[PDB]
Design a protein around this nucleic acid. Structure first.
Lengths: 40, 183, 541, 52
RNA sequence: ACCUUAAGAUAUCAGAGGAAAGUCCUACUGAUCAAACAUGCGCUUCCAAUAGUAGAAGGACGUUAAGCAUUUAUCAUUGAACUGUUCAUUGAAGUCAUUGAUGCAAACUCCUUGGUCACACACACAUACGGCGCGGAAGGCGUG
C-alpha cells in the first residue's frame, strides 16, 4: 500500500510532429537593409 | 474472514476401483480354450507382467502388470477383443491372496477391508514406464537405464536388446508357423 | 591496456572457453563461462567497451543457439540488451525466443508483455499483441498471471468499460488454477451495479428478456427488480462456477498434483518415472478433451521437462497422424525432434515411414545420403544395428524403385545389387564384432526363385563354406537358413531338393560342431523332414 | 571480429570443410585464434578414435 | 545535521487646516476608481416525449474492421553474370507496426449531462407577433 495508490497513467501515444525541428527553428534571416528606403 | 479457503474432500474408502496403485486387470468371459501361455501372449506387448493366472473352470483370469500405465493401456486397447471366439470384458480386480481373503471375509461377513497395493517408493530415475526388455551404457537420458527382467530381477538395459527382440521375433515366427507354440 | 584486452589475455578465459568448446552439451561450462564474461565487466553501462559488449552478445547468442529451451536466459539476454539502451534488438531477442518455442511459452509471453507495456505506448498495437498472445498461451493451467496483466491493462487504458466485461466473460469459462480470483472479481463487479441499463453490458437485451425473464426497460419501482436481476445473475454465475470448479479440481487431483518439474534443465538431467507416467496420462486426457489449442499447448508444455526422451515426440506425431490427419504436421514434428532427442533411432524409423507415406522420395534420398555421410560412408560398420537396418531397408526400397530388375519374373534385386551387397558382405566380414549377422542371413534367404537362389547360394553360402569361418559354421541357425533357402525353392522338385539337402548340405558340415548345430537342424528336421530324421541322427552319432 | 573466431566441434569431427567461420551460426562456439591449435589438439584422441 | 531572512509601500487626483522650501497628517471636505453586500430593471441568452418508447448537447482513450482508395520497409565493401539488373560475402547503424500508416465515409452500440416545473390541447400576426405563471444558470446595465 506504499505506492499502490500513485499508479501513473499509461505511456503517452506518439503523434508525428507538426512544427519545425529545434535545429531548423529560427526567426527571419536575410533581413534587407534600411538604406534603400531613405532614397525613395 | 477470508473468502478463499482450501478445498477439503472425503476419501472413497479404498476399494479396488478407486485405488490409484492398482495394476491387476480382471479378464472375464474367457472361453476355456485359452491357457496361461496364450493369455500371456495376448497381454504381453502392453507391458511387463508379474504373474498370469486362470482359475480352473472359473472362466476368468488375472494379469498383474508392473506399471499402472501398462494396465490402463491394456484395458483401453483390449476391450471386446474376442479370445477363442468369446468376447472379453476387462475391468480392475485384485490379487489371488486378496481374493481368497475377501472370499473368506464375505463368507464370514465380518469386515470387508482391503489394503492398498504397494507403491514404487518415488523418486525412481532409471525406469521409463510401459517399456519392454527381453535380454557400454553411458546412462544418458535418451536410453532406458534400468528395466525389469522377463519372468524376477532388475537388469541394466543394453544396446543389444533391439537385436535380441528381432532375433526372438523371427525365431517365434518360424517355429510358431510349424506349430510348436500357439503363442 | 584496456579492459577488453586484459580480459582476452587472461589465462582463465582460455581454460573456460576450451572447456565450453570441448563439451558443448554440458551447459555447466557454458553457464560458468557466461557468468565469468559478464562478471569481468564490473560496470554495465552505455560507455563500456564496444568490443566487450559484442563479445557478451555473441556468447549469449551462441549459448541460446546451443540450448534452445532456456526461457530464463532468453529473458536475461533481452533484459541486458534493454539495459544497454536499445530496445529494437530486445524486441528481436524476445520474438526469436518465442519462435524457438513455437509461440507457446507462458514465462516468455508473461515477461515479454510486462516489458511490452512500458515500451510500445500504442493502444491498438499493444492490444493486438495481447490478443495474439492469448490465442496461443491463454488456456495454460497456470495462466493466471497473463490474464491478470490483460485485465489490469484493460482497466487502466479503456474508458468505455465494455471490453472488460467481454474479456472477463471469456476468462470465467477457462479452467485456470486461480479461477476463484476471477470469479470473485465477477461477483464484486456484478454486485456494484446500480441501475437496470448497465445490465446490457452483461448480455443482449433480447437474451436477458427471453432466458432470464429480466426486462431492462422495466419502468416503475426498479429497486426490487434490480435486486431480482442481481439474484438471477448470481445464480447463473454459481452454476458456471460449479462446472469450472469440477473441471479444475478433477484436473488438479488427478494429474497436476503429481508433476513437480516444469522447466528445462539440461541434456544431462534425468526425469522421474512417476512424472513420466503422469505426463503420459495427462497428455492422453488432454487429447480426449478434444481442444486443438489446448492440446498443442499441453504437448509444448510437456516437451520442456522431457524433451530429450523422444517418447513425447513419438506420441505427438502419432496424435497428429491418426487424430488430426496431418502428415505434414507429423513430418515437421519428427524433423524438429530429430534435433532434440538423444536416441533418434525410433524417430528416424518413424520419419522414414512418414516421408515414404507423403510421396516425397527426393527428401528420403537426401536423408539416406545424409545418414550415410554422417558415418563417412562406412555405415556398414556402425556399432548400433538399428540405424544400419533401417537405412538398408529404405535404401533397398529406393534402389528397387530406381533400377530395373536384372532377374526374371520381375523379381526385383533387393539385396543382390552390387551397391548394397558390397555393404552387406563387408558387415558379414567382421563375424564377431557386430550384432546383426543372423538377422542379415535370415533376411537374405527370402528370394524363392531359381536364378535368385542360385545367385544367393553361390555368392554367400558357398563362399562362406569355402572360407570356413568357424563362427558361422558352428552356428546352427546358419545351417537352418541354408536348408530353408534350398527347400522353399519353387523350381526344384521335391525329390531333387530332398536329394540335394541330404547328400550335399549335411556332409559339408564338420562333426565337431554337432553339439552346437544339432538343436536347430533337428528343429528343422522335425518340422519338415520326419522321414530323413533317422538319416540325420545316424550320421551324427 | 578481433581475436575471436567461431569453431564447431560437430562439423569438425564430421570431417567437413566449414568447421571454422567468422559468422555467428547455429552450433558454433567462440575460441581464441591464438589457441585454435590447442583446440585441435584437444580433439585429437577422439578424432583418431573415429578414424580408427 | 544542516539551516536563521531582497528591500519598500495598501485608491487617486483637487480644495481647506495644522506640524521660504519641500516634508507629514486631518472617525476633514469634493470628484474619480476599485471591492464587498443589499437591491432592481416589461433588460439578453438557456433550462428534455409521456397525448409518449422519443430527443438535445458533449464524449468513446467503442464495434463493424484486415471497411473502400492510395503509399511505404536500409547504407557501405568485394566477388559473379548482365545489359542500369539479379545472386552471394564483410562491416555499420535499426521504435514497434504492414491485420500498420495515411485519405475518405457511413451505420450501429453505449456512457455523462438537463425544471424531464405549473397551467394549458387553445386560431395568432405589420408597430409582425400581450417578453402579463413560479423558479434556476449565466452575463449586461443602474441604484443604495
Amino acid at each position: 500500500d506504499v505506492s499502490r495508490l500513485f499508479k501513473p497513467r499509461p505511456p503517452l501515444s506518439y503523434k508525428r510532429p507538426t512544427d519545425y525541428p529545434y535545429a531548423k527553428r529560427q526567426t527571419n534571416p536575410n533581413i534587407t537593409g534600411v538604406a534603400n528606403l531613405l532614397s525613395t | 474472514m477470508s473468502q478463499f479457503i482450501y478445498p477439503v474432500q472425503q476419501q472413497p474408502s479404498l476399494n479396488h476401483f478407486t485405488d490409484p496403485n492398482n495394476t491387476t486387470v480382471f479378464i472375464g468371459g474367457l472361453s476355456s480354450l485359452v491357457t496361461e501361455d496364450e493369455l500371456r501372449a495376448y497381454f504381453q506387448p502392453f507391458g511387463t507382467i508379474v504373474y498370469v493366472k486362470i482359475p480352473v473352470g472359473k472362466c476368468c483370469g488375472f494379469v498383474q502388470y508392473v506399471d499402472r500405465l501398462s494396465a490402463e493401456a491394456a484395458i483401453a486397447g483390449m476391450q471386446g477383443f474376442p479370445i477363442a471366439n468369446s468376447r472379453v470384458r476387462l475391468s480392475w480386480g485384485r490379487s489371488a491372496k486378496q481374493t481368497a481373503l475377501l472370499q473368506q471375509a464375505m463368507l464370514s461377513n465380518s469386515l470387508q477391508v482391503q489394503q492398498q497395493q504397494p507403491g514404487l517408493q518415488q523418486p525412481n530415475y532409471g525406469y521409463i514406464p510401459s517399456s519392454t526388455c527381453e535380454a557400454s551404457s553411458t546412462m544418458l537420458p535418451g536410453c532406458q537405464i534400468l528395466n525389469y527382467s522377463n519372468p524376477q530381477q532388475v537388469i541394466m538395459q543394453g544396446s543389444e536388446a533391439v537385436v535380441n527382440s528381432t532375433n526372438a521375433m523371427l525365431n517365434r515366427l518360424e517355429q510358431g508357423s510349424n506349430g510348436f507354440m500357439f503363442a | 591496456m584496456d579492459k577488453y584486452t586484459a580480459l582476452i589475455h587472461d589465462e582463465n578465459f582460455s581454460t573456460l572457453t576450451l572447456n565450453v568448446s570441448r563439451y558443448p552439451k554440458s551447459l555447466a561450462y557454458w553457464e560458468k563461462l557466461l557468468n565469468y564474461i559478464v562478471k569481468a565487466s564490473a560496470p554495465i553501462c552505455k560507455s563500456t567497451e564496444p568490443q566487450l559488449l559484442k563479445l557478451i552478445r555473441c556468447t549469449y547468442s551462441s549459448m541460446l543457439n546451443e540450448f534452445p529451451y532456456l526461457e530464463n536466459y532468453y529473458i536475461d539476454f533481452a533484459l541486458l540488451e534493454y539495459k544497454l539502451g536499445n530496445v529494437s534488438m530486445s524486441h528481436k531477442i524476445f520474438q526469436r525466443g518465442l519462435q524457438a518455442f513455437n509461440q507457446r511459452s507462458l514465462l516468455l509471453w508473461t515477461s515479454y508483455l510486462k516489458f511490452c507495456n512500458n515500451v510500445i505506448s500504442h493502444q491498438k498495437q499493444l492490444f493486438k499483441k495481447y490478443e495474439t498472445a492469448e490465442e496461443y498461451v491463454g488456456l495454460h493451467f497456470f495462466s493466471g498471471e497473463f490474464w491478470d496483466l490483460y485485465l489490469e491493462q484493460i482497466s487502466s487504458r479503456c474508458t468505455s468499460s465494455k471490453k472488460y466485461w467481454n474479456v472477463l466473460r471469456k476468462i470465467l469459462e477457462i479452467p485456470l488454477h486461480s479461477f476463484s480470483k476471477f470469479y470473485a472479481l465477477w461477483l464484486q463487479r456484478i454486485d456494484d451495479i446500480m441501475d437496470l441499463k448497465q445490465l446490457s453490458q452483461l448480455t443482449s437485451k433480447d437474451e436477458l428478456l427471453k432466458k432470464l425473464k429480466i426486462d431492462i426497460n422495466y419502468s416503475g419501482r426498479k429497486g426490487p427488480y434490480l435486486q431480482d436481476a442481481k439474484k438471477k445473475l448470481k445464480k447463473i454465475t454459481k452454476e458456471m462456477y460449479m462446472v469450472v470448479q469440477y473441471q479444475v479440481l478433477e484436473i488438479y487431483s488427478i494429474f497436476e498434483s503429481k508433476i513437480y518439474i516444469n522447466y528445462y534443465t539440461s541434456p544431462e538431467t534425468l526425469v522421474s518415472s512417476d512424472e513420466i507416467e503422469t505426463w503420459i496420462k495427462y497428455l492422453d486426457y488432454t487429447i480426449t478433451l478434444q481442444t486443438d489449442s489446448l492440446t498443442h499447448l499441453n504437448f509444448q508444455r510437456a516437451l520442456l521437462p522431457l524433451a530429450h526422451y523422444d517418447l513425447v515426440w513419438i506420441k505427438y506425431s502419432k496424435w497428429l497422424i491418426n487424430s488430426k490427419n496431418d502428415l505434414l504436421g507429423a513430418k515437421n514434428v519428427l524433423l524438429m525432434g530429430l534435433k532434440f532427442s538423444l536416441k533418434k533411432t525410433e524417430i528416424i524409423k518413424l520419419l522414414y515411414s512418414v516421408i515414404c507415406k507423403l510421396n516425397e522420395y527426393v527428401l528420403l534420398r537426401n536423408l539416406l545420403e545424409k545418414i550415410e555421410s554422417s558415418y563417412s560412408d562406412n555405415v556398414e560398420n556402425v556399432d548400433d544395428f538399428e540405424i544400419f537396418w533401417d537405412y538398408l531397408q529404405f535404401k533397398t526400397f529406393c534402389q528397387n524403385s530406381l533400377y530395373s530388375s536384372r532377374y526374371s519374373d520381375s523379381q526385383s534385386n533387393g539385396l543382390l545389387n552390387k551397391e548394397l551387397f558390397d555393404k552387406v558382405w563387408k558387415r558379414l566380414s567382421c563375424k564377431e564384432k557386430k550384432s546383426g549377422q543372423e538377422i542379415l542371413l535370415n533376411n537374405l534367404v527370402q528370394f524363392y526363385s531359381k536364378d535368385t537362389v542360385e545367385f544367393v547360394e553361390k555368392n554367400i553360402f558357398q563362399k562362406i563354406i569355402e572360407f570356413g569361418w568357424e563362427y558361422y559354421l558352428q552356428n546352427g541357425m546358419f545351417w537352418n537358413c541354408y536348408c530353408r533357402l534350398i527347400y522353399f525353392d519353387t523350381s526344384r522338385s521335391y525329390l531333387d531338393k530332398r536329394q540335394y539337402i541330404v547328400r550335399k548340405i549335411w556332409p559339408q558340415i564338420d562333426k565337431k560342431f554337432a553339439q552346437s548345430v544339432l538343436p536347430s537342424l533337428t528343429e528343422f528336421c522335425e518340422s519338415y523332414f520326419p522321414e530323413e530324421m533317422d538319416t540325420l541322427e545316424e550320421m551324427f552319432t | 571480429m578481433r581475436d575471436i573466431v567461431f569453431v564447431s566441434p560437430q562439423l569438425y569431427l564430421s570431417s567437413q570443410e566449414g568447421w571454422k567461420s567468422d559468422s555467428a551460426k547455429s552450433g558454433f562456439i567462440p575460441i581464441l585464434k591464438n589457441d585454435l591449435q590447442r583446440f585441435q589438439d584437444s580433439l585429437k584422441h577422439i578424432v583418431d578414435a573415429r578414424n580408427s
